[PDB]
Amino acid sequence: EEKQRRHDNEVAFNAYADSTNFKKVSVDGSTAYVYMRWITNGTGTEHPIATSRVEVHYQTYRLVGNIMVDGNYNSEKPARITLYRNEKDKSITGFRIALQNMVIGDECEFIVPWYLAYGSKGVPASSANLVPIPSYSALRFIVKLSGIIPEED
Amino acid sequence: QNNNFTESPYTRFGLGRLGERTTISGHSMGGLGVGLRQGTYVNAVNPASYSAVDSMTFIFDFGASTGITWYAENGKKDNRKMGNIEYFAMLFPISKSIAMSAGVLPYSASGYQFGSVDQVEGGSVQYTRKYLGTGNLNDLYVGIGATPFKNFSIGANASFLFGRFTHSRQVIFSTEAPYNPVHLSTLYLKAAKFDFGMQYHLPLKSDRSLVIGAVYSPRVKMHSELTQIKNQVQNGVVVESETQEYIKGMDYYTLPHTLGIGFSYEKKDKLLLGADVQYSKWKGEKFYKSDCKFQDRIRVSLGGEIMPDPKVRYRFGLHGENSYLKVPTKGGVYQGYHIVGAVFGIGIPLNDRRSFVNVSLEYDRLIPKEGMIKENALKLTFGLTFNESWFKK
Amino acid sequence: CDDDLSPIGGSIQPPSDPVSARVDTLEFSVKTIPMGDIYNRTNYTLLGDLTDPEYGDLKADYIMQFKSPRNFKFKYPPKDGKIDSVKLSINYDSWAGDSTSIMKVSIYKINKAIPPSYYSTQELASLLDETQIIASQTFKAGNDSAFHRVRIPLPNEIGQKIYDLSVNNPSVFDTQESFYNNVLGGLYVTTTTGTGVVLSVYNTQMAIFYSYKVAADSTATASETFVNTSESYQVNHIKNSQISHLLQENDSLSCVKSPAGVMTQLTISKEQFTDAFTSNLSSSLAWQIGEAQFNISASKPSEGLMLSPPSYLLLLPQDSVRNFFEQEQTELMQPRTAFLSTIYNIKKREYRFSNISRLLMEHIKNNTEKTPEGKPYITKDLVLVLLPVKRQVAGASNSLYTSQLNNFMFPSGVKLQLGKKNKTARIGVYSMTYTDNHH
Amino acid sequence: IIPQGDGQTLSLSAQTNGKYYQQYSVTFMDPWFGGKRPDMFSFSAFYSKTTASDPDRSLQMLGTSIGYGKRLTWPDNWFQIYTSLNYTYYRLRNWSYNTFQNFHHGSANDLNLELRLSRTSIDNPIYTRSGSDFMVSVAATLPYSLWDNHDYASQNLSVSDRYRYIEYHKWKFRGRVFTPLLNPATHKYTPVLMSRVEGAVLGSYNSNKKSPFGTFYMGGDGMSSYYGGYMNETIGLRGYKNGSIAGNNYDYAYAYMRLTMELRFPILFENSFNAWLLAFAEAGNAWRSIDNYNPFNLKRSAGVGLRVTLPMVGMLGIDWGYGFDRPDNSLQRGGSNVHFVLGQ
Amino acid sequence: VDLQIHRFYLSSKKNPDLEKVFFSIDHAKGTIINKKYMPYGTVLDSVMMKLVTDFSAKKLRVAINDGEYKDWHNKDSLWLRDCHTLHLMVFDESGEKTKKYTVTLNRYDYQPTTFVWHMLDGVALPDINASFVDVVTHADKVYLVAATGNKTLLYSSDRKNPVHWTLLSSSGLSGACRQIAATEDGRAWILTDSGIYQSDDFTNWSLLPSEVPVTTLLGAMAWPQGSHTLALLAEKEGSLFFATNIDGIHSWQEQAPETFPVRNFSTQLYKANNHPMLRLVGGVTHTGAPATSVWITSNGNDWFGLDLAAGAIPASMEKGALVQTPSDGNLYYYATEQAEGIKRVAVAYSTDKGITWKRGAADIMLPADPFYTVGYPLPFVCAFDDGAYNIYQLGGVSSSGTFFSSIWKGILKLNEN
Amino acid sequence: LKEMKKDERKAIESFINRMGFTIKEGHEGQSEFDPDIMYHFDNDLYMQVLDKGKEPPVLNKTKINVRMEGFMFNRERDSIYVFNSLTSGGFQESVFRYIYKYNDGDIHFELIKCTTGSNLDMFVCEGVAFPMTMLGNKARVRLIVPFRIGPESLYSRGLTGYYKEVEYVFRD
């Protein structure tokens, strides 16, 4: 049941490697890796830092069924997301790994495995969001970076 | 959509191709229905032949057919396949001489489908034009025949005619989400036809026999309901199914007087020859919004049956006819056409010495005037005559 | 079993059977015109002020009246009578502008009667004859946490009068006129100074907090609410200013500002209709339009703007713009004349309508006349407008349908690409030309 | 189960599926009622009930019937007239299924008088070698619409007042013909040629009041309904899907016709075990309105199959058919299909 | 799973303020920096370093300045009183995997609000006896207005080099200058005992027609395109009301609060949210007591006060001076405070574009002028900015009698270069 | 599930006799209502019309706002939920469009979701909208709605609503 769910999630994620187009990437000093592309190339030589807040336009998908779960693309003002400040203000690890390598103007698509996105915790639907995240789900992100908030704020 | 019987474009006009009211045995002899007098099958052409069946019999006659048709044009060729059930009828005695029959036969059938793909005028994208048409006018008949005077017999058929004909024309656009139009015309027809037939059967010397028969069909006025619709479709039919007009009543469609004369010479269990001529007074008959000019229809048939002493009976026949309407030729005047045909069949008996299995093969050709559709059709027909001994004490 | 279009038939076809297809290019003429007063039945109002460099200014405030319950008679007789506080709460859910700009909101009391109308007004000069300042307080939109309220203390006299009228005085809380003329009048809510934010206020309440019954030998605060609803008449003062540069001629773009503001008007001439359909001299042909695409591309908004493009646009004839909203209709109730675009998505930034052939059919059908010497012709131009609307959906996830369609009451603005420079005001009308002589 | 006794029989049975559709039935026939001639007098009664989910979505039917059958010798000593009087009470408890038009909550009464004339002279019905079978039947009700004086044209008429007394007049006919190609005495293994013609019409007295009870469901193999009621006759048409001809999308026909031609090749003849191969060609259709009745442009099909007869089981078989024509309101031909036949 | 640091901070048993300091961690260069400088004069005797790491982190080694890599544990209170660089090395349980991190502590070596001041030589400020003196800077010209008794005098000088001052021939003016106002396009208004006077060149003055006797000219705006809104405070019946004089047309507005100043206040015109705005600081209330609030407005119809700290704005009985450095966007306000019976100069500064104000230390911000150590004999303070990290603080001595004599030029030390 | 039906039957029986109620039988299309008699309308609904009202509504056209006051009870525990909009303030009216559509059972309303504050949209059910088939504008009724035609959110818990007074007024 759920074990088969983990198995097909990881077999799919692994297939997204050989699917030549999408290079693998990682941050320094981490075995964790996220498969990513370069749909658009931006201008600049300033990567976000692990404690930087960046405003982006993003969409989130599951690898199984490709059901849209979150997205702000139907709005003009970008949404501000923090990479990591503390245990209350943070984001998933794959999101940090992907955004630490991008630059302003890029638009990248990256595949985050189950153990880097939410693990076994699972995301109940609850209020607001109506589509819950099944436990051990790999995610597919499309993120367009627009700029970087300075650390002085 | 299926057309089952015919896909000839000529059936766009009038009531389509006019069928005959003969069974497999009569059809295999070239269409002999008037001169024949045999109490072995159903001869619904001439009801006076009913009073020739044996005293304890229930003849149930089935039938089916298939075949292929080749159409030729100015430079193009095409071929289509048909196949359907021809008819089914029954015939039983009533008294010492009187007999009765019933069943279902087709009066006329019509069907066609054609068109082409072209480019939108003064534009770039492509569009498809399709013209379709189907239609059938059936015939549910009950007949009775008798022989009051010696060597003389009469018969009468009362028929209920119901039918429907639809003609449609449409264009299909090739865009993101268009509203394809469909202009459609439906026609419902009901009537009640009567046929009266007489026959004289003189037994000649030894075993020879002569049969002379006549049949008459009075003019029929048909109750009709015509509707013209203008639909728009996207995937299924959508809003604006506006009806352009609706006309209902009698005195709009007629069927003409019909006369038929047949003769037959029969040497018993050795030889049968027959011929017949049929005349239809289609000239001057009404048809609302007809796009053609009618003409009197002449049909000539002649055939024979030979069986030597396995027991399989052999039948052959030749038939010809002229068209009953003048279609409008392209850039010209209303013109007609002729039809000729040859039939050959076998009549294998069965074990109980009463039933029959008939198989026939027919080839016919349509001869137009010039620059029109040319048709050559081949047809294989399989029948069955189940004769059981009912009414036994 | 064979499905191929045979080409054989056609040499004996009747002369009046064949059909054909055609394409005609039709030109719009684009203008930007003042939208005018908007019909608004809901309880949403706008409070504040805004200034955008490419869209001009907007000042919005309002006048409200409370809904009177029948046989009010509120519980737990207050200890020795009297009450404590009459704090008034203005509730808002979202805002446009800067969430840190400081405004000053003032609450006045008027002595006139609210005019009966559901249209937003400008220059409400007659109503503000005397007025009377009740309260004033500074505020900002974003106050951290999620406390999206503005709480303003009020003098205890109004609450004391309400309590008195409900017990020792006749129960006049029966008709709205009696409540408005005796218990409490109309409240005028405005911002006296400050700029940079407009709040979309959805209701306003007046909580009268009293002590309690003696409660054995204790006491415990309890309260009333007195909300305002959409059953009564409000006054919305929406005034857009310095937008004259948006109305001038510019043949590449057309603007649509939302709260009143400006809108885009598209005009198809009469001759363009005349020498594209009907026309001729045989009078045996006819046209059956089956496809006319119409999609609009929005210009990329410049950085630093405070206003964002509206999510939906409604395209409909200018004559049917009043009765469309007065009857509270929906684009699913008039599928032939009103069209709703798709979501404004920043991937492509375009509003995509679809085949609008039914609109052209409708216009040709009931505007065709004949000169004395025949010659059928069209007599009136085709005038359409594009409006920003707010759509409320319902139904299952697979089958979402437009439950409600209201006029958009939030600051927004968009610059569409419609003009003669790049031939953007072009529609390709695909039609079927059959013949029909049964006349 | 045949409880023979008292010079007569009291056969009865009851079938209840493991999930719903409980039904019970009793039958009582007198083969020699009157004591003079073999005049059948049969009495049959039965009851059946069928069922967020469904709290009380239930359909229940009380049925009773009497029948007097004769053995006429006027045409010949084989004609068997049959007159019966039948009554059925329908009651519903919020039936969501669009079965029976809009009848969802009310209760209705059915009372019909049936007259049937038939002639049967076939051999052993398991594997017939020669003979015929003909039947003409009529079933009619009382035209209440001419006396109750309720206007059914308007829509404001009450649902209870509409579906309370069922009116129709249903006609049926059927004919089967068998013929052996070779002599049964000389050859035990002989091919059999078979032809079947059958059809029915469900009329109505008032053009607006039509019976929701008793419509036709055509297409596929055809044995019964596994999701709805049994008050719609199922007619099989080999070479098409189940309900494709009429019955899917909750479109039930009011007339139908079916024509079959078959050729049977025997294989096994041992005691009570028989098996044979059959090749068939069929044509049929079903129409929502009577005016569209067209016995010539039908939907065609052809194919082969296999049949096996087994004691205590009845008849078991498998057939393969190819459908050549597209059903109405569809864009796909019948194609290749496989059908399983159980029992008769 | 590998070795990384996700959060790092310092905490002291005696100093609780180290927790609030936030550190930014860059893995690509492996550096931990406090981008917000630690407050000046802090002490880091014994501090624990609390850090959130991955589970795979097993061993840590800490090197202080250029010391030795010492095996670190979570229960160590290290000594970093004089420590500005720190080296961290992380190992897993395997022991061969390494990763270097550098933590640099940023601190203010001196006071963040220190100023550097200089004399201006060759200054020739006129010896003028007047009660009200103001300075207005437009483009590249400073204009000093003085109300000498019943008359009004105007002087001009260069913004960059205010050494030389030239008298201006004022035409059309009458009465004594009560107040002045000016916009960004050079047009100026002066309110005197008579009606308001208007000019576009500070020389030719036209009497603006009016009927309502204005009491004070708060400020001037140019918001309606081509027009000039003019905020006024007038006297209706026996109360004070705000008023506007947009294009000569007069109007009445809300009632002024009782704490609103009427005299000796400093005004300034700025821009926010694509809209001109007015800021007003200090003054004397209608009753006579000083006012210690900051009032801002956007249209002149009504004003509101900000929520300041506990008396950050100095209380003065006379005219102050509000200046702005636009390069860093800093605001300064100099007033005269009666502290322990002595008139001293007090400074209130702001760095959040006027959102928040904090009282400053006079000895550091103000010059070290010896003549003003014992008091401020002059009855007003004048100061004007330059445009880039430069302020002028007119007044070195009382000159020959009244008025200033010398000019002081000052620069924030943080922005010296 | 049948246990819930039995518990509801017991609750209805114990509630009806608890205060003075005269249960009668009602037929569809009834026009004359005794202002002191509670009727049973074959849909398990109980109705006692306090005022017949005015002109009847138009199907698929009229939009009606309702103000209801009452509470919900179970077999042994009452006052689980209490709602009031006729006397206490601070509640937006609930608006529904009068339609007729058989989705699962009889549905006589289409609720328009209110998005302007606190309301009682979850207390509007088929039983509340049913009296509009017979009565008219400005109508005041008293209802006892069983769980089958009760609010859809409170369907699993099998609660029986008792609406002490429901008032219908046309327009938005």
Numbering used by the authors:
A (entry chain I): 31 to 183
B (entry chain F): 31 to 339, 347 to 430
C (entry chain G): 19 to 457
D (entry chain A): 503 to 553, 597 to 889
E (entry chain H): 39 to 455
F (entry chain J): 32 to 203
Please, what does the article write about this entry?
The β-barrel assembly machinery (BAM) complex is a conserved, multiprotein machine that mediates the folding and membrane insertion of newly synthesized β-barrel outer membrane (OM) proteins. Cryogenic electron microscopy (cryo-EM) structures of the BAM complexes from the gut commensal B. thetaiotaomicron and the oral pathogen Porphyromonas gingivalis are similar and reveal a 7-protein, ~325-kDa complex with most of its mass on the extracellular side. Remarkably, besides BamA and BamD subunits, Bacteroidetal BAM contains a 14-stranded integral OMP that is intimately associated with BamA. The remaining four components, named BamH–K, are all SLPs and form an extracellular dome-like structure over BamA that may provide additional functionality to enable the folding and assembly of the many β-barrel–SLP complexes that are a hallmark of the Bacteroidota.
Tagging PgBamA at the N-terminus led to low yields of intact complex owing to proteolytic degradation of the periplasmic domain, presumably by the ubiquitous gingipain surface proteases characteristic of P. gingivalis. A tag added to the C-terminus of PgBamH (PGN_1735) allowed us to purify the intact complex and determine its cryo-EM structure at ~3.2 Å resolution. The composition and architecture of the PgBAM complex is very similar to that of B. thetaiotaomicron, with a pronounced extracellular dome formed by BamG–K. Only very weak, not modelled, density was observed for the periplasmic components, possibly owing to clipping by gingipains, similar to what was observed in the isolation of tagged PgBamA. All components of PgBAM and BtBAM are similar in size except for BamH, which is 88 residues longer in B. thetaiotaomicron. Structural alignments of individual BtBAM and PgBAM components show high structural similarity for BamAGHIJ. The highest Cα-Cα root mean square deviation (RMSD) of 6.3 Å was observed for BamI, although both PgBamI and BtBamI consist of an N-terminal Ig-like domain and a C-terminal six-bladed β-propeller. The extracellular dome of PgBAM is much more compact than that of BtBAM, as indicated by the distance between the BamJ and BamK PPIs. A total of 12 glycosylation sites are present within PgBAM, mostly located on BamH (7 sites). The tri-acylated PgBamH lipid anchor is clearly defined and, like in B. thetaiotaomicron, positioned at the BamAG interface. EL3 in P. gingivalis BamA is 39 residues long and contains 12 tyrosines.
